[PDB]
Design a protein around this nucleic acid. Sequence first.
RNA 1: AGUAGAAACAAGGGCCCUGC
Lengths: 50, 696, 51, 50, 51, 772
Amino acid sequence: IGAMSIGEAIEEKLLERAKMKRDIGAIEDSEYEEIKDIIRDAKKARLESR
Amino acid sequence: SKTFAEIAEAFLEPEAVRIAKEAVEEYGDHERKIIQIGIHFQVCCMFCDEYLSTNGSDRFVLIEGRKRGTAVSLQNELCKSYDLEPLPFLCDIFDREEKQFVEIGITRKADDSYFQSKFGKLGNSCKIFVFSYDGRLDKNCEGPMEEQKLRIFSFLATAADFLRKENMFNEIFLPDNEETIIEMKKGKTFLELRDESVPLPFQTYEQMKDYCEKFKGNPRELASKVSQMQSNIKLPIKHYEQNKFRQIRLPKGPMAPYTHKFLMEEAWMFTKISDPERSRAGEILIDFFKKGNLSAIRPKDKPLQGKYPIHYKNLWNQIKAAIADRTMVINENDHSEFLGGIGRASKKIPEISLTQDVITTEGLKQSENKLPEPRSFPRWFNAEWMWAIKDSDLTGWVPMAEYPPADNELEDYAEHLNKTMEGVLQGTNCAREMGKCILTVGALMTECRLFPGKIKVVPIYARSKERKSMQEGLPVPSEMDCLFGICVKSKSHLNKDDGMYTIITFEFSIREPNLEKHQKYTVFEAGHTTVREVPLYLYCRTTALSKIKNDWLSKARRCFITTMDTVETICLRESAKAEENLVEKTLNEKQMWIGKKNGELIAQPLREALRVQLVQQFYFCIYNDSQLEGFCNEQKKILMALEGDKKNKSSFGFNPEGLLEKIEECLINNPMCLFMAQRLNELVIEASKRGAKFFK
Amino acid sequence: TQDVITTEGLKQSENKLPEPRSFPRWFNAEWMWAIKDSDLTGWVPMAEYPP
Amino acid sequence: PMAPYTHKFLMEEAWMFTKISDPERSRAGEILIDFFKKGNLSAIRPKDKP
Amino acid sequence: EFSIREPNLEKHQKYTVFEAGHTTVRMKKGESVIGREVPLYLYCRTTALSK
Amino acid sequence: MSLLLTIAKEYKRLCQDAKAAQMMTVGTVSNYTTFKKWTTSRKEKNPSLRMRWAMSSKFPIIANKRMLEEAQIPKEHNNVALWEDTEDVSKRDHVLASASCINYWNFCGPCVNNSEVIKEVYKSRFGRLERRKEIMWKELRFTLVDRQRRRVDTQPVEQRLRTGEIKDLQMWTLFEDEAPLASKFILDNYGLVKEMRSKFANKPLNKEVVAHMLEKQFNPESRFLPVFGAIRPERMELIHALGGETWIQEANTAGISNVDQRKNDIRAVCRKVCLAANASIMNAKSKLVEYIKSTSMRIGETERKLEELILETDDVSPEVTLCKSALGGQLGKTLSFGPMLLKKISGSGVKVKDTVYIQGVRAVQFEYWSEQEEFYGEYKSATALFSRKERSLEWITIGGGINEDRKRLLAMCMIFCRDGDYFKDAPATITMADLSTKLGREIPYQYVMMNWIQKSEDNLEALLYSRGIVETNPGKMGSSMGIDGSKRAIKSLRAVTIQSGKIDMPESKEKIHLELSDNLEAFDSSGRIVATILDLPSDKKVTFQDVSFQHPDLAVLRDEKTAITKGYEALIKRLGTGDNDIPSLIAKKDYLSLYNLPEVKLMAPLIRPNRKGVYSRVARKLVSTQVTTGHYSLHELIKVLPFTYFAPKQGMFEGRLFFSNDSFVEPGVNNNVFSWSKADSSKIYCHGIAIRVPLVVGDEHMDTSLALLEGFSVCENDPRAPMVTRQDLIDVGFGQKVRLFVGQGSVRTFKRTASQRAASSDVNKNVKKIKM
RNA sequence: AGUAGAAACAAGGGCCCUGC
């Protein structure tokens, strides 16, 4: 339930988990930045198709 | 659930529910609006919060919960007392430290539209606050106190979650000012139809609706129509005692022949001892082949009866050859192809390629379904029933699982009774026939699954254990593999249920045939076998099965469950009426009628009458068809009449001749139905010596 | 009666015997503990002493 | 198998709560009630699985 | 009965045992008394007697 | 890790498509549910047939591929196949396999470290097993059995909850990061959540399975069954092995599962508060609601609020009914007239007035119903099916088992129907004094006759005589009832029939919303009364264990212990949010400002005056020691603070800190005056009363975000505030804002400021200010 | 051939695939 669509919810949760891990867990800034770039590109493609 | 009030009571205070309920009753609006109002009301309430002013007096004064007239009275009173200008519309709350009314709004849409409409409606006269269930705020003045905002937004968050969870967070339950009229979108075509489907006297749905919405009861015309209908009917009522039942009329013609796939009374078997290493069927069929008896057989070209003897002879030779090569397969030649019906499936001819000349060339009339033809009472059935009641010199024919442990007397009782009954039944002949069906059909089912499109060879066998003598002699009696014949399948491509795969049956016997009973078979004189020397015959035929018959025959241990049920019920019923264990007594003493001999009745203890019921259940499993279905469905009416006769309950019926006709309609060429019909006639005859309602 | 007996399978109630057991490997510890001296004292009462 | 413990009470594995002795309440029925008052017994709440 | 010594399966066979919270033990410390918490066990058993 | 990046790449590839983008863009998240149905839909008619026909194949099962490679499960172990590289048509990421492969795994496959967690996942069924082992069977006997049909519960269950209260509980125990806003059920039942959480944390588990099993652990399975003997969930769970229509497997099953004891305790408490509130004359309604909400009780290990148990129970008794009515709880359609129970089957009617003369001429109004109605009726071990017609008992049938019960049931039915001449001309024994108004409260003539019967047995005999007596016709000898309650006689009562075999309790899965008056008599959309205060026992004394009537009227303690307790309550209420409260001071390490609180200043008069200096030294020491470092126990400062008000001095500290009434607290050990436990860390027990500590800060013991939820609240959304996770949520400052993701597809803004007010008062008060 | 009932089976799709 909620007010977000599916794409919005997915994106937001992925960014949150990326931070949650990079803060303490086994993740590097390089990996974090790569993940964030992938996600912003995915959002652009989703919103651009139509 | 079950009402919007009950739903709203989930997240509101029951008080606000009662308030909003009285309000909707006042305005007479759709009660699905109990929810919005309660929510709105509670917000206003928790906005007051029992705050106080500099003068130690209340700061806010609610006016929403009040009636409309009272609300207008207080609004004007306050506009006058504090010397304020009267407003055109009503408001929700009024404060004193600032002396200006305040209006509260709520909405779900994340846009200012609701606040724009309200601000246009009221300009800048008073303070307006519209909150959103998703955390937004629009106003025309300074923000409220902090605590007010926190409490309100928190409440609205909980409410939104609840509603979204109940699927009620929609325009329907939370509409704006405009979208408060929900209605079925009556189109154009649908209205055109509804005014056309009306009963006769009316011609437009409006007239029918007005006639039904205002209908008043007139009991007298109703009673008049009821009586009139009661006179032009003349329902017959027939007490059976006065109108007795004729006998049932079985059909006429030749006798119904043997129908079960395997032989039961005329079957002869070759036995050997079983070794655990070689246990599959395809192996047992070879072990029996090495000792040499199976190869001594050699029928001759002159059959005692039947048709197509050459095909059967060649097929038997190929069967022996295939067994000798240790590969249970047969090739597709002219003989096997003819007996297995390989290529005799119709050929298709599309109509798009059809013409009148084609039809006239070869007549293509509609297929004339040729329903079955009748038969007569079978005279060989009673012999089978008496043969399947006696012991068989061996036991353990039907495999069974183990007994679990036991902890209370109940389970001891259960184990004990179950052991006695199973020991009685496992020794009969009906049991060996059940075991034969179980194992042979299991083998055929596996083959049909693995090797379709290939003619195979499957034995007809069973496994048993020789009986237990006293401790004297050789102890630990041995096991036994028995072989009654050979079976052959033919390309069982069961692409779809209810399909059919023909099989062929070569069986061994030592009893010559009868034209009436063994009509379908093609018997041959094979040779000799021991016991001294005695002749041997080879019964051969062709038949079919399907997925369903396979599945049901393999599950042929249900007969035990039903039989045990009947017996145990009798015993416990007799034991309870006396409050004592009368189970062994009831099994050894209570006598049950079995049949007639020399015109007298016969009876025997329950312990020995079980076998009749067991055989009845097995035959139900074997000969079941639609005919037997309909018959067993129509005989209950007669038995209920009989019981009413036994207890002096003056039965009656509306049309008994029709019942007898329905019964006799389903009597055709089915040995079990014909047999049971003759026996039902005899039952009512034998009881007529003791009861009425039956004619001779 | 005889039928009741045959029905209930009555018999003479078999008598059980105590199973034999091994040597205890906790007795010495109990003895040792018992010999020690307790923090509190005066547990058992006794009478008085005449003249 | 080894011979198990047999005496009625426990000797070595025992334990005892104590309190001051009052000559006016020197009876079993009274001693027990007093021990219960200070609330050390009511606190004894055995868990389900032994 | 109450105890502060967990059981062993062999010596304690007739006993059903539980763990009833904790308790306290008191011991000297210089010129004062102190307390150290420990667990507590409850030993349950049935038995007969006579006159 | 790498998996996270893989999920990101997968989402990108999926968004590159065109249709997938549209479907992931339109609508809200709820669509997921819909999409979950349009896929993988395929059924079969006769699964038995297809199982025997499917297992006959070579590779009839599917299985994962990567899991098999990782486990190093070979193929063709000993000339027997185990699987083959292929792709099932539906999954496309599974590979065909054979049944033998399963056995291979079970015998020489990969082993998990431990699996005793299973005993917790399936607690209900191991509970069945354990209860069974403690049964002592007995002989088996044969006879006919009188099995009555009725609705019962078959699952022994502790803390039966609703469904909305489980769907959330399944989140805070298993999927906590995806948890929604904290609901009232969570904040109240904290220890319960902590308990269910301690077992299923840091364990290898399949969570869908665990979640379903939790639903089963909290469900009383209600069934409409034939039943005989006592009614207890422990028996109903194994009824199949206790008796049928013709046999009975005797066995004693009395001492197991302790269910009905809790229910009888609840009813005793309800009767207590109902009578107490009845003591009033003008506010019994508000008095009763207040007494209810101001009470708590223990259930097994957990502490529950009374009003929460009452809205969960299903005891159809005239006491539970009233309470459930005050609290606005819906309930079933079961009546009650004194000790008996009633339920209407059919018929209708409406009130009508009539009068009777008590002594000589004294007109007294009593009502009756003007129509015919049919009723099931139930007294102890006796059932009846009767009919009333316009102030008359038309007919009645009985199926009980005792003479005494038969007579009493018949008598209470006659009264319930106003049948007889007594309702036409009352007896001389009754007078205007016995009429009514113990203290002003009238009594309808019905209950008057009721108590007149319960007073003396001879009144009951006379009332039965009020029913016509006649000579037993032939044949009916067996179905007749004398005055003694004998199954047959030569002269029997009129229009009465007996029989062996109870009557089947009717059934209806209906609910009704009733209300009540200022005299505590509930009504149901009609003039019928379903419950009252005259139909329950007069009085009795009972000692309740593990109960908390933290309300003045319901208290027996003296002013001293009450003063101490109220001081502790006030001192805890300062545990909220905002500066000047103890959490902020601890955060700032201002251990000095605590000594100067006003609350300690109000408790100061209670300290032992002759040693207030010594305690002060010790008390301050502990506090500073705990605050300077950060390793503190929130339940210990709240205990010792009241002593830090005075100035330190010198002396010998024995180890205890005494108040002025010879009641002490000891710093470190729980005692009668101040107790708490790590199991339920949200309670403080003072003199038995319980005190709820708010959930604003979490010390070393409390170990999750569960302990912070009463400190946050929602506010107008602000895009400027930062966005954080649920774990960094502890590092915000009191009064700050932060955005956060909630549940699924939802973002909000929270502010670390609490609001202790509720909606109950803000609604009730403003309402009462409208009835003027 | 045969089966079964009030109509269907006695392979079906593209040399290969399969059995709701």
